[PDB]
């Protein structure tokens, strides 16, 4: 028998029936913190230092490790491109802070795409443009300060392969598509027009099935999520493909009494982790 079944190479063993020389012709048969509940760093004044930069959190049980997996360089068993990759390390795996957003009582919510956010920032950006192939994980840190008299709750989540959709002309008759500035808004991010369906026909209420953390003003002022590289290929174009989107949505609206500070910003600070590149040539912006 040829070992060409789709399940060949998995830890689970199935008992199947077959009458042909190819394994995939066989019957499906029968088989014979949790990765999905946003595992905290512990389950798997504080200071996270990476490169020449340091942010300050409070607890390791407050850092989510997406899918329970820490970022890593691509192993030889999964690699396919044969050139030696460049792993610049400290010049690219460090914290970059993007433009700050302003949280208002009627804000809808925002999203950023990765690695799009940094393709034009620092040495990371340069490497992303000079190489065809890119790969990395990310430490995502969202910051929001308010007083003990303010209230509100942001859901901060990482949605892998965040494909956006349109309102189809309102009536649903128009097969319109999101424009480039909407699918890859860059460093400044973009605003959601229908946060309830994440501008993609899926419920915000179930977004917690993805790696996430809440920023509930009365309890915390920051959220930190560590994201491993996720894709169906070991390396990919940092320009053509965004591996995941970061969503920051006010599920419980911001509120405070008149006279309390009304300028409440939200700041995103991100650090590539284990960034590596391959397929060197001239710089390409898109």
């Amino acid at each position: 028998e040829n070992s060409n079944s789709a399940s060949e190479g998995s830890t689970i063993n199935y008992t199947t029936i077959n009458y042909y020389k190819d394994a995939y012709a066989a019957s499906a048969g029968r088989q014979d913190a949790p990765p999905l509940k946003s595992p905290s760093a512990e389950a798997c004044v504080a200071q996270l230092t990476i490169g020449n930069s340091t942010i300050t959190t409070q607890e390791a049980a407050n850092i989510v490790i997406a899918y329970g997996e820490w970022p890593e360089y691509c192993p030889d068993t999964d690699a396919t491109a044969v050139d030696k990759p460049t792993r610049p390390d400290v010049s690219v795996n460090r914290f970059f802070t993007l433009d700050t957003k302003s949280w208002a009582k009627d804000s809808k919510g925002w999203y950023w795409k990765f690695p799009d956010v940094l393709t034009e920032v620092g040495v990371f950006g340069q490497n992303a443009q000079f190489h065809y192939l890119y790969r990395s994980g990310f430490c995502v840190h969202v910051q929001c300060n308010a007083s003990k008299f303010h209230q509100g709750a942001l859901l901060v989540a990482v949605l892998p392969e965040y494909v956006l959709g349109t309102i189809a002309g309102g009536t649903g008759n128009e097969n319109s598509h999101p424009p480039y500035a909407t699918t890859q808004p860059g460093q400044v991010g973009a605003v959601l027009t229908h946060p309830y369906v994440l501008d993609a026909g899926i419920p915000l209420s179930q977004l917690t099935v993805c790696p996430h953390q809440w920023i509930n003003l009365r309890t915390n002022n920051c959220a930190t999520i560590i994201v491993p590289y996720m894709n169906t290929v070991p390396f990919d174009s940092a320009l053509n493909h965004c591996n995941f989107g970061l969503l920051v949505i006010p599920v419980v609206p911001l509120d405070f009494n008149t006279g309390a500070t009304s300028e409440i910003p939200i700041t995103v600070t991100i650090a590539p982790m284990c960034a590596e590149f391959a397929g060197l040539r001239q710089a390409v912006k898109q």
């Binding site: 040829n2 070992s3 060409n4 060949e8 190479g9 998995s10 689970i12 029936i17 077959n18 009458y19 042909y20 020389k21 190819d22 995939y24 012709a25 066989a26 019957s27 499906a28 048969g29 949790p34 990765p35 999905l36 509940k37 997406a66 899918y67 329970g68 997996e69 192993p75 999964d78 003990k148 008299f149 209230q151 509100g152 709750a153 892998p160 097969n175 309830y196 419920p203 915000l204 209420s205 179930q206 917690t208 099935v209 509930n216 003003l217 009365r218 491993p228 590289y229 996720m230 894709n231 169906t232 290929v233 599920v251 419980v252 609206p253 509120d255 405070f256 009494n257 006279g259 309390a260």
Partner: protein
């Protein structure tokens, strides 16, 4: 040749039949698999992840759906008030429909096990108070008042001291499994009712909002299972998908 007799079932195509079929490509080998984070093996892994419950599922906020994701709590002038109520049936129309637990439940006919409802208070740090959250097993309607609701399974939550609390809805049923409850004979399978009452009051000092919101999430516990796989009522097709 070998003597054989064709039996009933011959030539039929049963969609769930797990048989063998001739491979169209001899000697073909697939692209090897690479490690990808987030593999799941059993839908129960997803059912145990908390997702938001639309407790505030009003006809009046269908056009501002975001408001369905949290419900209000505020300074009361009369004591023992009912804050919110809803059934505890995971696969029934209502608040549970917005949870991924509820949606996966709809791909099965029966379920069993304990559930968990987590309430997250998102008012200010200066706001404090206590609520009584009760799970009333089958028997009647929404308890008419707190002194009746407290006779059932319940937990007293101080949202001043802790922002989140979890109410466990323990599996209390006559049958080992429940088909999804709905009006009529199937109400025999109802899980019961969940109510949240003011134990003391929502209290604040001068300078903080007198109304805040609570977000409720739900998930299944480790003893939860589902049975008899079926198609869901929550997706249809009225026209071509182009």
């Amino acid at each position: 040749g070998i003597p054989t007799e064709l039996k009933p079932g011959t030539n039929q195509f049963l969609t769930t039949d797990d048989g063998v079929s001739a491979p169209i490509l001899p000697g073909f080998h697939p692209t090897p698999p690479i490690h990808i984070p987030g593999e799941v093996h059993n839908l129960l892994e997803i059912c145990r992840v908390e997702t938001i419950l639309e407790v505030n599922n009003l006809k009046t906020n269908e056009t501002t759906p975001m408001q369905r994701l949290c419900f209000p709590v505020s300074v009361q002038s009369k004591t023992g008030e009912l804050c919110a109520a809803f059934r505890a049936d995971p696969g029934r129309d209502g608040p549970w429909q917005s949870t991924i637990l509820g949606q996966l439940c709809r791909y099965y006919t029966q379920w069993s096990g304990s559930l968990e409802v987590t309430f997250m208070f998102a008012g200010s740090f200066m706001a404090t108070g206590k609520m009584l959250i009760a799970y009333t097993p089958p028997g009647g309607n929404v308890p008419a008042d707190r002194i009746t609701a407290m006779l059932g399974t319940h937990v007293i939550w101080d949202f001043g001291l802790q922002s989140s609390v979890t109410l466990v809805v323990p599996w209390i049923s006559n049958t080992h499994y429940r088909a999804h409850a709905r009006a009529g004979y199937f109400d025999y399978y109802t899980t019961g009712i969940i109510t949240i009452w003011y134990q003391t009051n929502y209290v604040v000092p001068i300078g903080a909002p007198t109304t805040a919101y609570i977000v409720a999430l739900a998930a299944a516990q480790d003893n939860f299972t589902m049975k008899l796989c079926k198609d869901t009522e929550d997706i249809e097709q009225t026209a071509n998908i182009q």
